Amino acid sequence: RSRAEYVVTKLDDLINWARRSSLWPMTFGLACCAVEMMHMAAPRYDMDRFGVVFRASPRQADVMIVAGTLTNKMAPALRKVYDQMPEPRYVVSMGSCANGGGYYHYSYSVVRGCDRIVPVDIYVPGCPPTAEALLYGILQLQRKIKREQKLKIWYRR
Amino acid sequence: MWFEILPGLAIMGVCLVIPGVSTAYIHKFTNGGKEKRVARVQYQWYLMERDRRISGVNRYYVSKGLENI
Amino acid sequence: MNNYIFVLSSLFLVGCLGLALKPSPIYGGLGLIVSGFVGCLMVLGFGGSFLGLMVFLIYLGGMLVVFGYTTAMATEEYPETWGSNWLILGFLVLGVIMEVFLICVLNYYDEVGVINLDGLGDWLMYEVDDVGVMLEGGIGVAAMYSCATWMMVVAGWSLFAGIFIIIEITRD
Amino acid sequence: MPSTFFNLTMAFSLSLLGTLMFRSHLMSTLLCLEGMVLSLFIMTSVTSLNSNSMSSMPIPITILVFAACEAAVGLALLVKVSNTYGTDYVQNLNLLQC
Amino acid sequence: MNLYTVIFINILLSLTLILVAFWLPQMNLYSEKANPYECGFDPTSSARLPFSMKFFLVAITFLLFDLEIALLLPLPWAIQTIKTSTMMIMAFILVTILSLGLAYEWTQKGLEWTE
Amino acid sequence: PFLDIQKKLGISLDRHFMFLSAEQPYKNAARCHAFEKEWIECAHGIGGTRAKKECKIEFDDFEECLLRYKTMRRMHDIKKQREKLMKEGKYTPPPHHSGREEPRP
Amino acid sequence: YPSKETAHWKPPPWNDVDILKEKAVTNMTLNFGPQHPAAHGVLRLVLELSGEMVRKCDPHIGLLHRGTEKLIEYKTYLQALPYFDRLDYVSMMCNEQAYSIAVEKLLNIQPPPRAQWIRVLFGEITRILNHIMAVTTHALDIGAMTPFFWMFEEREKMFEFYERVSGARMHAAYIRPGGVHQDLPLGLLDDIYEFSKNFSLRIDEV
Amino acid sequence: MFFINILTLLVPILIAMAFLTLVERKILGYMQLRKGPNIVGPYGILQPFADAMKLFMKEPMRPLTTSMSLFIIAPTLSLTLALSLWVPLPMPHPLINLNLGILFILATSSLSVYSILWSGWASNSKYSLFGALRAVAQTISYEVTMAIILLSVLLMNGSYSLQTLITTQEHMWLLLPAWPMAMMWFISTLAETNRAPFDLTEGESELVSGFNVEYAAGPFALFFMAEYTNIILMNALTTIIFLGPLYYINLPELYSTNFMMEALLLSSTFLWIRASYPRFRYDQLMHLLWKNFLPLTLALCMWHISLPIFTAGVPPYM
Amino acid sequence: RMMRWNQERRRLLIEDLEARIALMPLFQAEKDRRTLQILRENLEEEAIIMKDVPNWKVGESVFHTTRWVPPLIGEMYGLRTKEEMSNANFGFTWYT
Amino acid sequence: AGRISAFLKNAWAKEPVLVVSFSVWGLAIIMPMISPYTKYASMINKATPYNYPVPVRDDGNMPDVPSHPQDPLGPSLDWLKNL
Ligand SMILES: CCCCCCCCCCCCO[C@@H]1O[C@H](CO)[C@@H](O[C@H]2O[C@H](CO)[C@@H](O)[C@H](O)[C@H]2O)[C@H](O)[C@H]1O
Ligand SMILES: CCCCCCCCCCCCO[C@@H]1O[C@H](CO)[C@@H](O[C@H]2O[C@H](CO)[C@@H](O)[C@H](O)[C@H]2O)[C@H](O)[C@H]1O
Ligand SMILES: CCCCCCCCCCCCO[C@@H]1O[C@H](CO)[C@@H](O[C@H]2O[C@H](CO)[C@@H](O)[C@H](O)[C@H]2O)[C@H](O)[C@H]1O
Ligand SMILES: CCCCCCCCCCCCO[C@@H]1O[C@H](CO)[C@@H](O[C@H]2O[C@H](CO)[C@@H](O)[C@H](O)[C@H]2O)[C@H](O)[C@H]1O
Ligand code: SF4
């Protein structure tokens, strides 16, 4: 390694830290799992103290939290709003329905896991996961973002 | 606790005093140790231009007293 | 700085050329806003103050209403800009070229007549009362309240009657 | 002064040419009238300043007052035109040829 | 000169932030990303179609009321006149007729938005 | 005016701010006040037709004062002749025309 | 005098009133949701608009249709019970109680007295859980965001009663045909009393 | 030296804006029984910098239906005008001393609406057009009375010069003789800054994000920076007009310290108000201004023409 | 309190304006001499610059009348530097 | 006049803003007519010397014009000093 590689590595940390520290999820919730998402924003857990702020516009969002069941009728709309998030963007699959169809896995009308529609960064189990379990998954996304090495990889190309 | 809001407020408060204070001090530094002259009307501008012309150095704020006459 | 007012009046001319080409009223409204700002600067440049700020403020309000009216009653699927139509674009470029030509030729024939490019900046301010106090344009406008009250009577009546007029025009 | 007044008169002439050469939107023409008003305001204001004629400065303000009334009526008429035809196009305003 | 200088710096700072914002980030342009937003479904028409204005009469009333305040803004200079009674009557009459105009439009339901 | 109502009633709605020489706020005389006063006074009582010929001196002076065609041309000629001589190296502007004056007072 | 140019001119109308072709109705059509703060994430409300006046509301639903009713046909009666937690998933135990009563009726059995008192107790806790969500999110959609936060801390305490009887904060599956799954843990009534005696002040603040 | 003075105005104002985003989020949090940011830096004091760096590292939107010139211009115009509003502010000595500084404020503030109008139109989407047309209505609502409210106050000042307001209030806050206008002025500045309960051009519960809905990344940040800078500006203006900070010719910094304290307090009440009330309907804002403020504003303008004449209290011209 | 304070500010303004009245004779005399000296300086350079120009009369008036006509700014500063001319056109109005 | 009193009372309870507007408007007109200080406002504007007071040529028939600014002749401003 070299001082040019050291500088690149410290810059990766800085840009990674900025995206860790200001994760703005879309105002986007599908079913009962969204109720526990409200409880993560509520005072006991206060997601906003970690820097997590809902914004309704996909253009102003970084994270999609798929919080509930994804039906076939809903699937194109979810794909649309994912595509309209500017990058870098992340997806958190929350709950059994989003994770793999859950209680409705065998239904004619249900997508068996949102990871058939969008890429998923974190899978949060539970039906619903508790507000705390969701918060744990959000903090696992932050640590994943902490591991991104995009500038180091650019330098070595 | 509510008093944990204060670190941001103090930073805000410091940042909002600097413009007023810095402008007052930079005026005195660039106007011979005095307030920057205000020319609301043409008469005041005329006095400044006369002050500049008699100053000997082309600066209105360099004043000349009875030692000059 | 000797070219300052000529540059502004030159910018004002371009703004009216843009308006005259009549793109979508959205850009027409913008053209008048910029011309109004440039017109305010010219009034300021000649020693004005109140009159320049008034006309900009009035036209800022006026074009906001025109923006609202445009989105409701003067809009198409593909609003036109100055560049959208080759024909409008060409007359925009040709109009600017003809401005340079007209000023260039008039400078040659007279040299001091309408165009005096040699003397720009020498004939902006003519006389100024150097030691005066009460000289700003607001004082002159304020004579409507004392010495020119008839001017204010007619102005006030037209705004008052205008309310009754627009209510009648707009009722179904 | 000499060159500024030439440019302002040209600006009025262009705005009048805009008024006289219709395209489709009536609103685009109403904007050209406001352009002529604006040019005449500056010409009057600059003349009053250049001659130090403080008793004439009410006049430019009265120009804007009546221009506002003219513009308000123009917009009021444009609402009526749009209600009839669903556009402000002037080619629809042709029933009075017969 | 100073006012020109600072406003240019203000313009200069704003434009630099725009250039940074457009040339620093990694891009990935594709059609679905850049299509207009409408809550996950496609728009059924252009956003450029007519959008009705229900307060159009208030809007053109505002044009006249904005020239009324233009007639009022010389008042700080006008109160310096020797002809105090004349100035006071002119200002009182001007405000009163504007009030009567507003009162008439109010009672004609001109401030009510159309349905 | 077409109807002289104002004269009949002895009032003034718009007769008193008709020209430069009229009353100004705070007695701030307009440009060319003295020339316009002379032109108006020469013309008074003799009618427009006679005034056109017989007050021609006053009108020309006032016209020159207000529009300044001759003043602008005269300065253009001096500044143009100075440009020619300086290029030929026959004229050198004095120190007070070059920005190195001894300012008064 | 007839001319080729004016051959197509007709005389004007007798009263100056022209019969023009019907003008074009041109209402804005807008997708209000599913991805919209006020649409609950899954409502595609198609609106006909004139300005901001609403001319027609066409609610498109089925964006959360999951075929619960068909799925229940493949379940035993006990297996179907948790599907009722996930219907009105703001009033979970009340949904269980409806299904439990229906099954109990067809079974011609009755739940014991203590079960019925528990079921009413938790039915009314659930009603408060629901009305908090109904009132404060309704306020949040109108712009008053703060009551949501005060009252969702109260909700978090009631989720603890759910989790203490059933092990789950929401989808308890606690009320079943025949009664309830388990008896109350020792100390739960006291904690429900402690919550209950302060809650009316929380209502007063809102 | 004048360039150094520009820096010592712009840079502290931009830092004050950034930390107002932190103060808002913590004050709102505590009124909601939360904490707000307390991880990103000590007590959250690096959270604004993280949000800024995130936004400018994000992909900026280039939507296909968009008319691109106005789309770029509007957020650029927004920040320019917000910063320009500060240059004539006397704290107690302004960077730019203007004879008609109040009229400069109105004209500059009135041009600021066009950033909202053009961005919403240029985006060429339905929710952005809705936001633009609410801005049209918003300006029609409040601009009708804001200048008359100012007019009545300045009949005790005697001029449009902001620095003269300091001398006018040498012995007393203008609040005392003008508190009814101060109340109406305060509501007007909330609407003028598109703040709650009049946050209608964005109004996220109704229009998702209104005028800026198609905006991402750094261009989005400019609108946000411009809005938070204007909140401080309008309250600092309210402080100088109605709450005359204590001025002593030999202690100018005393004015600056007192000015900041009152301006900080007035900015806090903006955040306090947001946490307390529901939103108006945008037709109801028009009726508030035109059927309540406007009658009283006109009566009080007549009263404040009448007052200096019958008390012989006309202020000096100079 | 505003009545009393504004009445005091009116007395202060009169005192300030009366100081101007006392000094105005001196400023008028200085300004007369300054304007005439500048005009004199222009006349001498015109005598050299327009020496070999046919039919030029040095110092000729453009008016028929013989009464004093104050010079324009363009006349006074026509032969001086661009900065002196710019200062006369924009000094006051660009001083903020 | 008991019918109006009920009217005014209802207007006060239900439309107080309009009641205040009309009352303030009426007070603004009335106050200059009944105030003892109204006459001074014009006199103060008249005593402000924005222009140089041009002296007059003394012809020997001006008993009322001061010869010096501190002569006891001419307009006094004691009324304003003690206003
Ligand atoms: C939309 C923008 C349009 C831009 C328009 C063009 C702007 C540039 C203006 C060019 C016009 C002439 O601009 C400039 O005028 C000044 C007078 O002030 C002349 O003045 C100078 O040169 C001439 C002789 O050449 C003499 O007067 C003298 O020596 C000196 O004063 C300059 O030589 C000329 O270059
Ligand atoms: C049919 C509808 C018309 C009727 C309604 C209008 C009624 C008239 C109201 C306006 C009255 C204007 O009244 C007029 O005021 C001006 C000043 O403004 C007075 O003017 C007087 O003072 C000015 C001050 O400069 C002198 O220059 C002037 O020579 C002198 O006459 C007139 O003597 C008076 O007649
Ligand atoms: C005199 C003429 C000189 C020669 C001119 C040659 C011009 C050729 C330009 C090539 C395009 C460069 O422009 C840039 O291309 C990149 C990748 O190529 C694309 O950029 C973006 O979109 C694509 C979409 O898949 C991604 O693959 C890419 O990584 C991303 O950065 C855009 O299209 C544009 O941002
Ligand atoms: C239809 C529209 C109706 C609304 C308009 C009504 C306007 C009527 C206004 C009536 C009030 C006039 O009030 C009038 O004020 C002036 C000064 O201004 C007072 O005038 C008094 O003070 C002035 C100084 O200002 C002295 O020069 C004067 O000698 C003295 O009378 C009058 O004593 C009072 O009567
Ligand atoms: S995983 Fe469970 S709680 Fe979440 S939406 Fe599906 S059924 Fe509801």
Author numbering:
A (entry chain B): 33 to 189
B (entry chain a): 1 to 69
C (entry chain J): 1 to 172
D (entry chain K): 1 to 98
E (entry chain A): 1 to 115
F (entry chain e): 1 to 105
G (entry chain D): 20 to 225
H (entry chain H): 1 to 318
Text taken from the publication that reported this structure:
Respiratory complex I [NADH (reduced form of nicotinamide adenine dinucleotide):ubiquinone oxidoreductase] is a key enzyme in mammalian metabolism and a redox-driven proton pump central to oxidative phosphorylation in mitochondria and aerobic bacteria. It catalyzes NADH oxidation and ubiquinone reduction, regenerating nicotinamide adenine dinucleotide (NAD+) to sustain oxidation of carbohydrates and fats by the tricarboxylic acid cycle and β-oxidation and feeding electrons into the electron transport chain for O2 reduction. It also captures and “couples” the free energy liberated by NADH:ubiquinone oxidoreduction to transport four protons across an energy-transducing membrane, contributing to the proton-motive force (Δp) that is essential for adenosine triphosphate synthesis and transmembrane transport. Mammalian complex I is a 1-MDa complex in the inner mitochondrial membrane that contains 14 core subunits, conserved from bacteria to humans, plus a mammalian-specific cohort of 31 supernumerary subunits required for enzyme stability, regulation, or assembly. NADH is oxidized by a flavin mononucleotide at the top of the hydrophilic domain in the matrix; then, the two electrons released traverse a series of iron–sulfur (FeS) clusters to the terminal cluster (N2, just above the hydrophilic–membrane domain interface) to reduce ubiquinone.
We present a 2.4-Å resolution cryo-EM structure of complex I from mouse heart mitochondria in the closed, active (ready-to-go) resting state, with 2945 water molecules modeled. Our structure has a fully configured ubiquinone-binding site that is sealed from the matrix and an α-helical ND6-TMH3, so it is in the closed mammalian active resting state. Although most of them are located in hydrophilic, membrane-extrinsic domains, densities from well-ordered waters were observed along the central axis and E-channel and in the ubiquinone-binding channel. Here, we explored structurally defined Grotthuss-competent networks at the top of the ubiquinone-binding channel but could not identify any complete pathway to the matrix in our active resting state. In our mouse structure, we observe a complete Grotthuss-competent pathway for proton transfer within the E-channel, between ND1-E24 in the ubiquinone-binding site and ND1-E143: E24–Y228–E227–a series of ordered waters–E192–S109/Y142–E143. In addition to inferring the states from hydrogen-bonding patterns or simulations, it has been proposed that only neutral carboxylates exhibit well-defined cryo-EM densities, and here, we observe clear density for both oxygens of the ND1-D199 carboxylate, plus density for a coordinated water, suggesting that it is protonated. In our model, the ND2-E34 and ND4L-E70 carboxylates are directly hydrogen bonded to each other, and the density suggests that the proton is on ND2-E34, not on ND4L-E70, consistent with this suggestion.
